[PDB]
């Protein structure tokens, strides 16, 4: 019999990632793992047909069952509205899910030794996690003020942002709740423990002494109170850094740390965004949603619609599953599932490291103008190779 993987929430998506998603389930997951699968179709046509109710249900299912794996979906714009004759310009599914669940998005690369990187010294992953606008034009002279009116009726506070004495300009207001900062802290500490690396927070608290100082203070208070003992047990630490110092140190590091950032296209140089997953980590320590860091790869899908050959990287999508299942295994103390998830990840890394890869990675190594057809495998060929290697890997582990 297969591995009993338990309860997993699955979200089907759009275009090229939809094709790859089904191949991942068919060739890599279903042949080895049985799931109590809570499956939701977040394809654009179904979201339209259900008036986006399917997206809300999916979010609630993740809250209920703790483990979510999601395929990339189309975020509608005016162009998509015309393409699919949509009823409305539906909100980003990711945005709707994030609002219901809360949490912090962490991005982790899939490390392959033969794939060029920004700093050659980076041998371990650098897992980065990021935390309303209210801006307006100032047409002419006048005061911009920002006020705080306590809910308890005590005297309101008025700060002068700027008195425009001559000419116009622009002004802006921003905020951050302590609760959100607390969630951000908890998620970051939990992430550092689960992966087994040190955590760093970066802020500009020298300039924004009160705004960014709150982030520094809250992280320290929660660290010293709730996480310091557990960190020291694994030979791990937490320290605050200034953003300028943090980047300079990271560029001369070996990697292998969590970077909580207070504020994507840089990371695409590492092969592509096909080598980056995006995991939402909720502050409860229980709930996770995993997906690829890239979109639906529309350009590749158009070629697929015409019957032309495609070479789309399934790694990020594959690692959405493995990091989803790894969390599932951790929650249920499921040693068999834990091993399988690891095995699939290693198989994927090994296959690329042995010279079998999709065009994006071949282009990163050799340069796009220099890439020939013999340097890479198409989408189907690469999936077949992974499946063959997966079978061989699992047979070896049975000894």
Ligand X SMILES: NC(=O)c1ccc[n+]([C@@H]2O[C@H](COP(=O)([O-])OP(=O)(O)OC[C@H]3O[C@@H](n4cnc5c(N)ncnc54)[C@H](OP(=O)(O)O)[C@@H]3O)[C@@H](O)[C@H]2O)c1
Ligand Y SMILES: C[C@H](O)c1cccc(NC(=O)c2nn(Cc3ccc(F)cc3)c3c2CN(C(=O)c2ccc[nH]2)C[C@H]3C)c1
Binding site for ligand X (CB under 6 A): 72-75, 94, 248, 272-274, 291, 294-299, 312-313, 316, 360
Q: 248 to 307, contacts with ligand Y by CB under 6 A?
A: 250, 255, 265-267, 269-270
Residue pair 69/39 in contact by the 8 Å Cβ criterion: no
Q: Of residues 85, 132, 235, 306, which one binds a second copy by CB under 8 A?
A: 132
Residues 120 and 244: their CA atoms lie apart, in Å, by 21
Please tell me whether residue 137 binds a second copy under the rule CB under 8 A: yes
Q: 241 to 280, contacts with a second copy by CB under 8 A?
A: 244, 247-248, 251, 264-266, 268-269
Q: Least distance in Å: CB of 38 to a second copy?
A: 30
Residues 142 and 140: their CA atoms lie apart, in Å, by 7
Please tell me whether residue 335 binds a second copy under the rule CB under 8 A: no
Angle between helices 379-397 and 335-353 (to 10 degrees): 130
Cβ distance to ligand X smaller for residue 26 or 224: 26
Q: Least distance in Å: CB of 362 to ligand Y?
A: 13
Residue pair 263/131 in contact by the 8 Å Cβ criterion: yes
Cβ distance to a second copy smaller for residue 250 or 318: 250
Residue pair 44/87 in contact by the 8 Å Cβ criterion: no
Residues 220 and 138: their CA atoms lie apart, in Å, by 39
Please tell me whether residue 95 binds a second copy under the rule CB under 8 A: no
Residue pair 64/22 in contact by the 8 Å Cβ criterion: no
Please tell me whether residue 126 binds ligand Y under the rule CB under 6 A: yes
Please tell me whether residue 364 binds ligand Y under the rule CB under 6 A: yes
Q: Least distance in Å: CB of 244 to ligand X?
A: 8
Residue with tokens 């590492």: 270
Residue pair 328/334 in contact by the 8 Å Cβ criterion: yes
DSSP structural state of residue 154: P
- What residues make contact with ligand Y under the rule CB under 6 A? 109, 111, 116-118, 122, 125-126, 128, 247, 250, 255, 265-267, 269-270, 364
């Amino acid at each position: 019999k297969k591995i009993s993987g338990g309860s997993v929430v699955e979200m089907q998506g759009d275009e090229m990632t939809r094709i790859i998603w089904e191949l991942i389930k068919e060739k890599l997951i279903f042949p080895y793992v049985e799931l109590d699968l809570h499956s939701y179709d977040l394809g654009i046509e179904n979201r339209d047909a259900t008036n986006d109710q399917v997206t809300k249900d999916a979010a609630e299912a993740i809250k209920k069952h703790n483990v979510g794996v999601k395929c990339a979906t189309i975020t509608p714009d005016e162009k998509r509205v015309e393409e699919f004759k949509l009823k409305q310009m539906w909100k980003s599914p990711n945005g709707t899910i994030r609002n219901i669940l809360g949490g912090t998005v962490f991005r982790e690369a899939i490390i392959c030794k033969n794939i060029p990187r920004l700093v050659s010294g980076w041998v371990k992953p650098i897992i980065i996690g990021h935390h309303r606008a209210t801006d307006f034009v100032v047409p002419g002279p006048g005061k911009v003020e920002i006020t705080y009116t306590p809910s308890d009726g005590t005297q309101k506070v008025t700060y002068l942002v700027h008195n425009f004495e001559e000419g116009g300009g622009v002004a802006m207001g921003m905020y951050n709740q302590d609760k959100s900062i607390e969630d951000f802290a908890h998620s970051s500490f939990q992430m550092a423990l689960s992966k087994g690396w040190p955590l760093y927070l970066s802020t500009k608290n020298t300039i924004l002494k009160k705004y960014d100082g709150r982030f520094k203070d809250i992280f320290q208070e929660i660290y010293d109170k709730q996480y310091k003992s557990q960190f020291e047990a694994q030979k791990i630490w937490y320290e605050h850094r200034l953003i300028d110092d943090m980047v300079a140190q990271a560029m001369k590091s070996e990697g292998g740390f969590i970077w909580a950032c207070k504020n994507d296209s840089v990371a695409q140089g590492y092969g592509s965004l096909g080598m980056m997953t995006s995991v939402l980590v909720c502050p409860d320590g229980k709930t996770v949603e995993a997906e690829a860091a890239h979109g639906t790869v529309t350009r590749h899908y158009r070629m697929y619609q015409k019957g032309q050959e495609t070479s789309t990287n399934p790694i990020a999508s594959i690692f959405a599953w493995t990091r989803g299942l790894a969390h599932r295994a951790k929650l249920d103390n499921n040693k068999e599932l834990a091993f399988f998830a690891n095995a699939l990840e290693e198989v994927s890394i090994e296959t690329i490291e042995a010279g079998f890869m999709t065009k994006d990675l071949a282009a990163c190594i050799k340069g796009l103008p220099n890439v020939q057809r013999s340097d890479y495998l198409n989408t189907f060929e690469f999936m077949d190779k992974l499946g063959e290697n997966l079978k061989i890997k699992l047979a070896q582990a049975k000894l």
